[PDB]
């Protein structure tokens with residue numbers, strides 16, 4: 001058994017016994033599985049664009065696509081865009097839960113931040129990408145392109161995305177990047193769209209667009 005280098009969460013996550021798969025234990029209920037299936041049947045396009053593939057279930061374990069698999073030198077950031085259980089967001093509209101090398105910058109997931117500190121932590125996450133500005137702003141722009149489409153699509157989806165995170169990834173060489181939505185354990189059916197979750201994504205798009213544009 002090989003422990004998966006998580007960025008955040010308390011969940012039991014291991015490498016699969018084969019390439020490109022992780023096993024996440026459903027700790028408290030099978031609700032994450034129920035919600036993958038429900039999204040599979042009602043919003044399959046959403047599942048295809050924005051969510052790691054669910055290959056299968058093994059008792060309490062989900063076999064998930066390893067979002068880090070195709071990266072020589074992956075940098076990962078977990079941002080919670082869904083509602084916290086109780087507790088307000090550490091950055092108002094969202095909470096950064098962790099990032100690759102966040103220890104080196106004295107990052108603390110319990111610390112409520114100003115806009116300045118929030119933006120500095122995202123700048124911190126981007127430092128591994130090096131001083132070549134053209135290729136780091138390409139990463140920012142590919143993230144903005146997918147996040148924009150996600151915020152657009154969220155208006156047409158009647159789910160409360162309580163607890164869901166965005167996983168931002170980029171390779172050290174800035175050759176490759178992505179962002180995807182994870183963690184549906186606390187997602188709920190509702191009769192409208194999720195304005196809190198949409199505001200989290202639009203606020204991130206704002207921050208990233210400010211970085212992509214600064215000189």
Ligand SMILES: O=P(O)(O)O[C@@H]1[C@@H](OP(=O)(O)O)[C@H](OP(=O)(O)O)[C@@H](O)[C@H](OP(=O)(O)O)[C@H]1OP(=O)(O)O
Nearest residue numbers: 010011027080083084085086087162163164185186
């Ligand atoms: O991620 P969602 O679901 O929102 O809730 C998590 C909660 O976050 P928030 O909701 O308070 O942000 C964490 O509290 P934090 O240390 O961040 O204050 C809990 O430690 C964690 O429960 P744990 O697994 O530790 O028992 C929850 O996950 P779960 O309920 O899916 O297990």
Ligand SMILES: Nc1ncnc2c1ncn2[C@@H]1O[C@H](COP(=O)(O)OP(=O)(O)O)[C@@H](O)[C@H]1O
Nearest residue numbers: 006007008009010011052064065066067078183
């Ligand atoms: N499919 C995935 N591929 C790669 N890393 C993942 C994947 N899903 C989760 N992770 C990693 O695991 C961490 C916790 O994921 P999450 O599903 O939110 O667990 P929890 O429900 O315990 O919060 C993330 O911060 C990320 O580092």
Ligand SMILES: [Mg+2]
Nearest residue numbers: 009163165183
């Ligand atoms: Mg989580």
Ligand SMILES: [Mg+2]
Nearest residue numbers: 163183185186
């Ligand atoms: Mg969870």
